[PDB]
Design a binder for this molecule. Structure first.
Ligand SMILES: Nc1ncnc2c1ncn2[C@@H]1O[C@@H]2COP(=O)(O)O[C@H]3[C@@H](O)[C@H](n4cnc5c(N)ncnc54)O[C@@H]3COP(=O)(O)O[C@H]2[C@H]1O
Lengths: 179, 179
């Protein structure tokens, strides 16, 4: 049940420090083309396949720019930088949305752990732990609307023809339906 | 035993990506006063008290500068920045050493978890988990001399008159004894 600790680490050491400041950074970018959505969209692939370049996971997800970096002193590191990337979502050659998009990195940690023999984490427990991570993280944000309003969890499982851009657009449009 | 997963997360998502590049960044700073030591000194307070400003933990630990930032694309974030701070260690008004110093942030996560009721982590298990983190992390680096040569773990426990700068200097001088 390592996924439980990674979910809490994900919130304590990240979501709870950037999301209270995200709207400010979003509106700052729009001021100083297209309107960036005001939520952090977090990709939770249950197969734990976490590429580093989204464009390689789906060409329709096209990097646009970066937000204004957030900084802060943490654990003896001066000016620890929290940066986020803005992606355009394409659909049949058209820009259907623009949002701050990224994977949940701890799912990449789960994947790596399953390969290290010293970690005592079997390759078979990847899916189960990924789901415990999603469930735990969802339960955490349910008790912190400050952060829940600032992000949407996009958990998915590829069966083999899958569209990641279409998966994001579904959440991005259901959010605009209640805007 | 959440400490086990945080230790592996600490290595997979950090130590294993900066330490192979640390010497290059150290020597770059010395080129482009005093010689910075060529190891990352990581503070592991077993009481899990992890301030964000080292100078507040001990005035003899004085921030000097930052290293050249390392960057890389991780989990959909373009140019994720890994930064490190250089500290001078004072001793009776004299500069006894200079090194890249910082706390192990996951110990700060353990502390926060113990306060959240939803996390199911008792306040009493802080010390035990801190030690499991130290032990686990030490065992990981023993199997990766690439990273072990590039860092020294400084685990300590305050009894109530403690000197943190003197604690670091002891490790910094034992390393120069076999230089
Ligand atoms: N700037 C950022 N950008 C994107 N995501 C961020 C982030 N800061 C935190 N997170 C998310 O939160 C997790 C836990 O962060 P934490 O700092 O407590 O725990 C971190 C931290 O103690 C250490 N670490 C990683 N990157 C670091 C950095 N740039 N500076 C200092 N420590 C770092 O490794 C642990 C695990 O890192 P990991 O990435 O796997 O897991 C991170 C990551 O998924």
């Amino acid at each position: 049940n390592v996924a439980h600790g990674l979910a809490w680490s994900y919130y304590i050491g990240y979501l709870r420090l950037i999301l209270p400041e995200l709207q400010a950074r979003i509106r700052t970018y729009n001021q100083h083309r297209g309107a960036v959505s005001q939520r952090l969209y977090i990709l939770l692939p249950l197969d734990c396949g976490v590429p580093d370049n989204l464009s390689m996971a789906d060409p329709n997800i096209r990097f646009l720019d970066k937000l204004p970096q957030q900084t802060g002193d943490r654990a003896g590191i001066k000016d620890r930088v929290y940066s986020n990337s803005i992606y355009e979502l394409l659909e049949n050659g058209q820009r259907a949305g623009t949002c701050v998009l990224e994977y949940a990195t701890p799912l990449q940690t789960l994947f790596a752990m399953s390969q290290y023999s010293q970690a005592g984490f079997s390759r078979e427990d990847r899916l189960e732990q990924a789901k415990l991570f999603c469930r735990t993280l969802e339960d955490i944000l349910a008790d912190a609307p400050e952060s829940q309003n600032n992000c949407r969890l996009i958990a998915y499982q590829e069966p083999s023809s899958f569209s990641l851009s279409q998966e994001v657009l579904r959440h991005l449009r259901q959010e605009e339906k209640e805007e």
